[PDB]
Structure formats: structure tokens, C-alpha cells
């Protein structure tokens with residue numbers, strides 16, 4: 001369990017499920033946002049290598065796992081950013097500025113959140129964030145455009161419904177992926193099948209005109225030290241995105257990881273956790289120097 005405890009917090013009829021350890025102290029608290037179709041426990045690999053003197057919060061994103069799934073919820077990046085601000089206000093996480101960490105769709109929400117509520121965030125860590133406008137499409141984005149041409153919504157690579165589709169999703173999302181036995185693939189996809197209608201609705205909403213490039217559209221408003229962590233072998237969100245952010249945001253440190261695909265937090269958890277803590281210390285040192 002790593003000392004992480006699951007709790008639920010309510011905003012009227014909406015509930016957020018989150019895991020946590022430690023308590024608000026002198027250092028900035030850390031709020032972690034997972035990616036598309038995942039949940040708060042994808043952060044456990046990194047938490048295992050994080051120090052115990054930090055206040056860590058890992059929240060299930062809107063409609064995922066223990067957080068409310070409602071047909072009336074606004075699943076656009078703007079609406080998810082707003083839900084995250086309600087959750088933050090619920091826990092009083094912004095009592096003093098906090099460090100905000102996000103991966104992929106969570107990375108996009110994190111970037112847009114720092115642009116919407118700049119006084120809430122002390123520093124940002126964006127792990128292969130979605131929401132950028134690339135000059136050319138990688139094979140995955142060319143596949144999505146091809147699927148749009150036949151409206152084959154049942155073939156979205158990140159929404160598998162069969163063992164063979166699950167094996168393709170596992171290959172696309174990680175650099176090293178040896179073949180898994182059919183029984184294990186079947187078990188992995190069965191836990192996701194009841195949630196595929198929601199993932200299909202969420203996916204179409206985050207790739208819609210209003211959300212597809214919202215991080216790129218808001219990155220001029222990010223005013224805090226930002227760390228970018230990206231895997232050079234990312235087959236989902238191309239690693240060229242790291243330079244687009246770095247050249248558009250001041251005080252930006254880029255960490256390109258070798259032998260690493262889209263699932264950074266699962267593939268390189270030790271290096272990722274080390275980079276997270278090192279960046280936190282360098283931000284504190286520059287803040288102590290800048291005084292007066």
C-alpha cells in the first residue's frame with residue numbers, strides 16, 4: 001500500500017476518490033493526475049521511490065474509478081480542469097501553492113490548470129502531456145484519422161475490447177512489451193470492458209476541436225518553473241512535444257528518457273521519482289536565491 005490511504009471527498013452530488021500519505025507541511029504538497037482510462041494507482045510505481053516526508057495526493061480523474069461518472073459532467077479539458085479546482089478547494093490543497101504533476105491527458109489538465117489558476121501552483125511537472133499541435137502526425141494519430149474516415153469508433157487503439165486488441169494497446173503504450181499469455185490479456189480487458197462506453201465518450205471529447213490543442217493554446221499563460229519528462233520511444237504522444245513546450249515556457253527543464261515509451265511512470269519509475277524530487281529542490285534553491 002506504500003502508506004497510501006483511499007478517501008472520498010464530496011462537492012454537492014459529485015465525489016472525488018483519492019489516495020494520500022503525509023500531511024500539509026513546509027514543503028509544497030504534490031497533486032498527481034493520471035492519464036486516459038487509468039486511475040490514481042498508476043502513480044504507485046513512482047510513489048514507491050518517493051521520500052516519506054512529502055504530502056502526496058493521487059486523484060481519480062472525472063468519470064474514472066472512484067470519482068463520479070455522470071452523463072452531465074463536462075469531459076472537455078476545460079471541464080476537467082474545473083473539476084480538479086473543485087477537488088483542490090475541497091481538500092484546501094491550494095492553502096499555499098502546490099506542486100502539480102500530470103501524465104498524458106492528466107499532463108494536459110495540469111498544464112491548463114496552471115494557466116487558469118496561476119496562484120495555486122508553485123511548480124509543474126508534465127510527463128508526456130497531451131494537448132499539443134504537432135506539424136506532422138505520428139502513426140497513432142494517422143490511425144485515428146484513418147478510423148474517422150470509416151467511423152470505426154470500436155477500433156480506437158486505446159479502447160481494446162478483445163485480447164488481441166489488449167496486446168496491441170500494451171505494445172503501443174510501452175517500449176518493451178514481451179507477449180502476454182491469452183488468459184492474462186483476457187483478464188486485463190475484462191476489467192475495462194464495462195467502462196469502454198465511458199472511455200469512448202471521453203476519448204472523442206478530449207480529441208474534439210475544443211480540447212485537442214488546449215495545452216498548446218494555454219502554454220503562454222504558464223508562469224511557474226516547469227519540468228517536462230518524456231520517453232524518446234513514445235508511440236502515442238510524440239517526444240517532439242517536449243521542445244515545443246520548452247521553447248514556449250520560461251524556466252523549463254526537459255528530461256528525455258531513453259528506452260521509454262508512453263507509460264513513463266510504469267517504465268522508468270525510479271528515474272522519474274528522482275527527477276521529480278531533484279526538480280523540486282532546484283526550484284526551492286532558485287527561490288531562496290531570488291529573495292529580496
Ligand SMILES: CCCCCCCC/C=C\CCCCCCCC(=O)O
Nearest residue numbers: 035036104105130141144145148207
Ligand atoms: C477523430 C479525430 C482524429 C484527429 C486527431 C487529432 C489529434 C489528436 C490525436 C491524438 C491525441 C490523443 C490524446 C489521448 C490521451 C493520451 C493517452 C493517455 O492519456 O495516456
Ligand SMILES: CCCCCCCCO[C@@H]1O[C@H](CO)[C@@H](O)[C@H](O)[C@H]1O
Nearest residue numbers: 144147148151152153204207208209
Ligand atoms: C479516433 C477516431 C475513431 C472514429 C471516430 C468516428 C467519428 C466521430 O465523429 C467525429 O469525432 C471527432 C472527434 O471527437 C469530432 O471532431 C468530429 O466533429 C466528429 O464528427
